[PDB]
Amino acid sequence: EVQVIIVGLGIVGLAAAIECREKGHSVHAFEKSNILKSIGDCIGLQSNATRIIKRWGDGAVHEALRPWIVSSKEIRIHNSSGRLIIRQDLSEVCEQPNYLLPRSELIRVMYEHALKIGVEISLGVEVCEPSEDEEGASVVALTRDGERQIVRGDFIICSDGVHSKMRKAIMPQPVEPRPSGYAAFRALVDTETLKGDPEASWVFEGVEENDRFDVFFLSGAQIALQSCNKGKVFSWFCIHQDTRNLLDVWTSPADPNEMLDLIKVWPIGQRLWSVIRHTQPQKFINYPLLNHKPLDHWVSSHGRLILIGDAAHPLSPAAGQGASQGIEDANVLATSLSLAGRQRVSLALHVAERIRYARASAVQLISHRVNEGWRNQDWDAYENIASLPLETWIYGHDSQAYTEQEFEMVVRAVQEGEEYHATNLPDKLRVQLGIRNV
Ligand SMILES: Cc1cc2nc3c(=O)[nH]c(=O)nc-3n(C[C@H](O)[C@H](O)[C@H](O)COP(=O)(O)OP(=O)(O)OC[C@H]3O[C@@H](n4cnc5c(N)ncnc54)[C@H](O)[C@@H]3O)c2cc1C
Ligand SMILES: C[C@H]1CCN2C[C@]34Cc5c([nH]c6c7c(ccc56)OC(C)(C)C=CO7)C(C)(C)[C@@H]3C[C@]12C(=O)N4
């Protein structure tokens, strides 16, 4: 069988480990940090990701995620007066299960399942210096004491995220992401104090039957507020202007009073603050929003290393499709591997790339267009960021069925040196954004 080395066990790394293991390959994954640690807030997983997860363990992971199934029927969008300006229907977006849950709860479920099916995992191991010949690939596993050990396999999956040193070490970016001037406050609300605060009691209305999903458009502030799992968890997100050179990390605490000043001058500010103020000061995150440009390649020159997830195509955590596209990366890669075999590993990596590239790039450039904008307080139907790009061509898409159907055509385009034109995204969208094939 094929020996797979996975660097980075975030969401995408864990999914690739499970997807490769379930499709019959040997998997050794490395992670430098304690990942069973409660950090960050909520991740959303849309239908194109949950139909992939549905296959894991013949439904077992889906069943473990069942309390996190989204029950919202609409997105209720308001102006700064509190007036409901738009409802966005979710009956088709949620025809199939969507998930919304803390990142730490999703990491734990995926991680427990990866061990159970025999993924080999090494925590507390920083991986560096990839190398590849035409018969295999290798990485150097570092321990904190200075020790170096060569680890060998058939190819390397770099899922080490937005700060991929794997990417730096191989196919680095010419210039840094440039700061957009916007950042994102985001956090889990503390529920044990949210309860018993009577001025906040209003947020519990109906959350047992329909998870809250409210959005607020203010001047220089886009705010969302969400419940999941029958009101056991509340999260919130506020996009706002910021010129400071922040670090795009997930541990730098920020001053809650900045958020209070943003909203208190508006008639809706008091209601919203009665919830937001129950955030643990340790958990208040101000996360800069950078625009990353698509890479020229995800696969290295010798075909035995591939960047996936945030290493490949970092999206705004306000995309809605960030983790979902990464889970799609994993399934397509593992499906390509099984159709190719151990004698055609480099073929499999090049196929997965042609299948994923234009789609992932379209989500990248769309979700930034919808995030980018200079709207004033009359916010209209299609609209400057409302989370309305729930397109069926995104959430209704079955990436594994597409890979099985297209695999021989892509292989033909690889081997004959021609361009593959994926149809897993609208044709017009490619030309409108200027997507150039890999
Ligand atoms: C601590 C943390 C909290 C986050 N919280 C949120 C959140 O609340 N909401 C949200 O929308 N997104 C959050 N994200 C980002 C989110 O996981 C990603 O945007 C995406 O969903 C998954 O991308 P990924 O798995 O490719 O990369 P990531 O999820 O960023 O994971 C990459 C992993 O690789 C590890 N790594 C890096 N270099 C090496 C190396 N050399 N050797 C070994 N391991 C290495 C990192 O330690 C990390 O565990 C968080 C990310 C992190 C790291
Ligand atoms: C700053 C506010 C303003 C508007 N918000 C919307 C959002 C996109 C989005 C979110 N959750 C989503 C979501 C989705 C689809 C899209 C989103 O669908 C399912 C069905 C999976 C259920 C719950 O989860 C938020 C994290 C709340 C962010 C945060 C934010 C924003 O920019 N983009």
Short mmCIF file of all heavy atoms in Angstrom, two decimals, residues 408-435:
data_model
loop_
_atom_site.label_atom_id
_atom_site.label_comp_id
_atom_site.label_asym_id
_atom_site.label_seq_id
_atom_site.Cartn_x
_atom_site.Cartn_y
_atom_site.Cartn_z
N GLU A 408 -10.37 9.78 -15.79
CA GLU A 408 -9.72 9.42 -17.05
C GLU A 408 -9.58 10.61 -17.99
O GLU A 408 -8.61 10.67 -18.75
CB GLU A 408 -10.48 8.29 -17.75
CG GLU A 408 -10.47 6.98 -16.99
CD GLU A 408 -9.07 6.47 -16.71
OE1 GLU A 408 -8.14 6.79 -17.48
OE2 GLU A 408 -8.90 5.73 -15.71
N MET A 409 -10.52 11.56 -17.98
CA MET A 409 -10.33 12.73 -18.83
C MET A 409 -9.17 13.59 -18.34
O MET A 409 -8.36 14.06 -19.14
CB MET A 409 -11.61 13.56 -18.91
CG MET A 409 -12.73 12.92 -19.73
SD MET A 409 -12.25 12.55 -21.45
CE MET A 409 -13.74 11.75 -22.07
N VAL A 410 -9.07 13.81 -17.03
CA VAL A 410 -7.96 14.61 -16.52
C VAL A 410 -6.63 13.92 -16.79
O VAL A 410 -5.64 14.56 -17.16
CB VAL A 410 -8.13 14.89 -15.01
CG1 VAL A 410 -7.04 15.85 -14.54
CG2 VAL A 410 -9.52 15.47 -14.73
N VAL A 411 -6.59 12.60 -16.60
CA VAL A 411 -5.37 11.83 -16.86
C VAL A 411 -4.94 12.02 -18.30
O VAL A 411 -3.76 12.22 -18.59
CB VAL A 411 -5.60 10.35 -16.53
CG1 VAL A 411 -4.54 9.48 -17.21
CG2 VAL A 411 -5.58 10.16 -15.03
N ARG A 412 -5.91 12.00 -19.22
CA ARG A 412 -5.64 12.25 -20.63
C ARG A 412 -5.05 13.64 -20.84
O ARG A 412 -4.12 13.82 -21.64
CB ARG A 412 -6.94 12.09 -21.42
CG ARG A 412 -6.79 11.86 -22.90
CD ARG A 412 -8.15 11.88 -23.61
NE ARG A 412 -8.01 11.92 -25.07
CZ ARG A 412 -8.96 12.34 -25.90
NH1 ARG A 412 -10.13 12.75 -25.42
NH2 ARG A 412 -8.74 12.35 -27.21
N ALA A 413 -5.56 14.64 -20.12
CA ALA A 413 -5.02 15.99 -20.28
C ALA A 413 -3.65 16.12 -19.64
O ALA A 413 -2.78 16.82 -20.16
CB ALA A 413 -5.98 17.03 -19.69
N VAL A 414 -3.43 15.43 -18.53
CA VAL A 414 -2.09 15.42 -17.95
C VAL A 414 -1.10 14.79 -18.92
O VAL A 414 -0.08 15.39 -19.28
CB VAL A 414 -2.09 14.69 -16.60
CG1 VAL A 414 -0.67 14.52 -16.09
CG2 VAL A 414 -2.93 15.47 -15.58
N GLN A 415 -1.42 13.59 -19.41
CA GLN A 415 -0.43 12.81 -20.15
C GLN A 415 -0.19 13.38 -21.54
O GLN A 415 0.93 13.29 -22.05
CB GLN A 415 -0.86 11.35 -20.20
CG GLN A 415 -0.74 10.68 -18.83
CD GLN A 415 -1.13 9.21 -18.81
OE1 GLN A 415 -1.73 8.69 -19.75
NE2 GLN A 415 -0.77 8.52 -17.72
N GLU A 416 -1.21 13.98 -22.16
CA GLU A 416 -1.06 14.62 -23.46
C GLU A 416 -0.60 16.07 -23.35
O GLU A 416 -0.44 16.72 -24.38
CB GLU A 416 -2.38 14.57 -24.25
CG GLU A 416 -2.98 13.18 -24.47
CD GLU A 416 -4.34 13.23 -25.17
OE1 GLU A 416 -4.82 14.35 -25.46
OE2 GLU A 416 -4.93 12.16 -25.43
N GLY A 417 -0.42 16.58 -22.14
CA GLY A 417 0.04 17.94 -21.95
C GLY A 417 -0.96 19.03 -22.29
O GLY A 417 -0.57 20.15 -22.63
N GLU A 418 -2.25 18.74 -22.19
CA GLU A 418 -3.26 19.73 -22.54
C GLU A 418 -3.96 20.24 -21.29
O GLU A 418 -3.82 19.70 -20.19
CB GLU A 418 -4.27 19.15 -23.54
CG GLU A 418 -3.94 19.51 -24.97
CD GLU A 418 -3.76 21.01 -25.16
OE1 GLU A 418 -4.58 21.80 -24.63
OE2 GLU A 418 -2.79 21.40 -25.85
N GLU A 419 -4.72 21.32 -21.46
CA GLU A 419 -5.41 21.92 -20.34
C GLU A 419 -6.74 21.21 -20.10
O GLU A 419 -7.47 20.89 -21.03
CB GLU A 419 -5.64 23.41 -20.57
CG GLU A 419 -4.36 24.22 -20.52
CD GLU A 419 -4.61 25.68 -20.26
OE1 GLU A 419 -5.76 26.02 -19.88
OE2 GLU A 419 -3.68 26.49 -20.43
N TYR A 420 -7.01 20.94 -18.83
CA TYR A 420 -8.29 20.39 -18.42
C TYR A 420 -9.20 21.55 -18.05
O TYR A 420 -8.79 22.46 -17.33
CB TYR A 420 -8.12 19.44 -17.23
CG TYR A 420 -9.43 18.91 -16.70
CD1 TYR A 420 -10.23 18.10 -17.49
CD2 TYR A 420 -9.87 19.23 -15.43
CE1 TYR A 420 -11.43 17.63 -17.03
CE2 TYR A 420 -11.08 18.75 -14.94
CZ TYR A 420 -11.85 17.95 -15.75
OH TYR A 420 -13.05 17.47 -15.29
N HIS A 421 -10.43 21.52 -18.55
CA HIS A 421 -11.42 22.54 -18.20
C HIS A 421 -12.42 21.88 -17.27
O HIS A 421 -13.34 21.18 -17.72
CB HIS A 421 -12.08 23.13 -19.43
CG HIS A 421 -11.19 24.08 -20.18
ND1 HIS A 421 -10.87 25.32 -19.70
CD2 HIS A 421 -10.53 23.94 -21.35
CE1 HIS A 421 -10.06 25.93 -20.55
NE2 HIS A 421 -9.84 25.11 -21.56
N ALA A 422 -12.23 22.10 -15.98
CA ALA A 422 -13.17 21.59 -15.00
C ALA A 422 -14.54 22.22 -15.23
O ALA A 422 -14.66 23.37 -15.66
CB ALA A 422 -12.68 21.89 -13.58
N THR A 423 -15.59 21.44 -14.97
CA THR A 423 -16.95 21.95 -14.99
C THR A 423 -17.56 21.95 -13.59
O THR A 423 -18.77 22.13 -13.47
CB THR A 423 -17.83 21.13 -15.94
OG1 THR A 423 -17.73 19.75 -15.61
CG2 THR A 423 -17.41 21.34 -17.41
N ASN A 424 -16.75 21.75 -12.54
CA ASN A 424 -17.24 21.80 -11.17
C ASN A 424 -17.34 23.24 -10.65
O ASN A 424 -17.22 23.48 -9.43
CB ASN A 424 -16.39 20.90 -10.25
CG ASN A 424 -14.89 21.25 -10.27
OD1 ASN A 424 -14.44 22.21 -10.88
ND2 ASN A 424 -14.11 20.45 -9.56
N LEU A 425 -17.57 24.18 -11.57
CA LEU A 425 -17.86 25.58 -11.30
C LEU A 425 -18.43 26.20 -12.57
O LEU A 425 -18.15 25.70 -13.67
CB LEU A 425 -16.60 26.34 -10.85
CG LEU A 425 -15.66 26.74 -11.99
CD1 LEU A 425 -14.88 28.03 -11.65
CD2 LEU A 425 -14.71 25.60 -12.32
N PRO A 426 -19.25 27.26 -12.46
CA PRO A 426 -19.82 27.85 -13.68
C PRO A 426 -18.74 28.29 -14.65
O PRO A 426 -17.67 28.76 -14.24
CB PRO A 426 -20.62 29.06 -13.15
CG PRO A 426 -20.83 28.78 -11.69
CD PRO A 426 -19.62 28.01 -11.25
N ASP A 427 -19.02 28.13 -15.94
CA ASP A 427 -18.08 28.54 -16.98
C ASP A 427 -17.86 30.05 -16.98
O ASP A 427 -16.74 30.52 -17.18
CB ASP A 427 -18.57 28.08 -18.35
CG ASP A 427 -18.72 26.57 -18.45
OD1 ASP A 427 -17.74 25.85 -18.17
OD2 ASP A 427 -19.83 26.11 -18.79
N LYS A 428 -18.93 30.83 -16.80
CA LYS A 428 -18.78 32.27 -16.86
C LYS A 428 -17.88 32.78 -15.76
O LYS A 428 -17.13 33.74 -15.94
CB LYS A 428 -20.15 32.95 -16.78
CG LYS A 428 -20.11 34.45 -16.65
CD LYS A 428 -21.50 34.98 -16.28
CE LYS A 428 -21.55 36.50 -16.21
NZ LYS A 428 -21.97 37.01 -14.87
N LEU A 429 -17.91 32.11 -14.61
CA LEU A 429 -17.24 32.61 -13.43
C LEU A 429 -15.73 32.62 -13.63
O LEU A 429 -15.04 33.55 -13.18
CB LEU A 429 -17.62 31.74 -12.24
CG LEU A 429 -17.50 32.35 -10.86
CD1 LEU A 429 -18.53 33.43 -10.71
CD2 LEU A 429 -17.74 31.23 -9.92
N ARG A 430 -15.21 31.61 -14.31
CA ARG A 430 -13.78 31.53 -14.61
C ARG A 430 -13.30 32.78 -15.35
O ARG A 430 -12.34 33.44 -14.93
CB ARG A 430 -13.53 30.27 -15.42
CG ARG A 430 -12.09 30.00 -15.75
CD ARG A 430 -11.91 28.50 -15.86
NE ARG A 430 -13.10 27.87 -16.41
CZ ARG A 430 -13.44 26.60 -16.22
NH1 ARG A 430 -12.67 25.82 -15.48
NH2 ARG A 430 -14.55 26.12 -16.78
N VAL A 431 -13.97 33.13 -16.45
CA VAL A 431 -13.55 34.26 -17.26
C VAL A 431 -13.77 35.59 -16.52
O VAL A 431 -13.02 36.55 -16.72
CB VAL A 431 -14.31 34.24 -18.60
CG1 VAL A 431 -13.54 35.01 -19.65
CG2 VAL A 431 -14.57 32.79 -19.05
N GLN A 432 -14.82 35.68 -15.70
CA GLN A 432 -15.14 36.94 -15.02
C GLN A 432 -14.11 37.27 -13.94
O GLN A 432 -13.85 38.45 -13.68
CB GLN A 432 -16.56 36.87 -14.43
CG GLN A 432 -16.72 37.46 -13.03
CD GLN A 432 -18.15 37.35 -12.51
OE1 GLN A 432 -19.00 36.70 -13.13
NE2 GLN A 432 -18.43 37.98 -11.37
N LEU A 433 -13.51 36.25 -13.34
CA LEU A 433 -12.46 36.43 -12.35
C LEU A 433 -11.06 36.28 -12.93
O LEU A 433 -10.08 36.55 -12.22
CB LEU A 433 -12.62 35.44 -11.20
CG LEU A 433 -13.87 35.51 -10.31
CD1 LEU A 433 -14.16 34.13 -9.73
CD2 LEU A 433 -13.65 36.50 -9.20
N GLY A 434 -10.94 35.84 -14.18
CA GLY A 434 -9.62 35.65 -14.75
C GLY A 434 -8.89 34.49 -14.11
O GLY A 434 -7.76 34.62 -13.65
N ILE A 435 -9.55 33.34 -14.06
CA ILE A 435 -8.88 32.14 -13.58
C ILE A 435 -8.09 31.54 -14.73
O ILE A 435 -8.64 31.28 -15.81
CB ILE A 435 -9.91 31.15 -13.00
CG1 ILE A 435 -10.55 31.75 -11.74
CG2 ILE A 435 -9.23 29.81 -12.71
CD1 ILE A 435 -11.85 31.08 -11.35
#
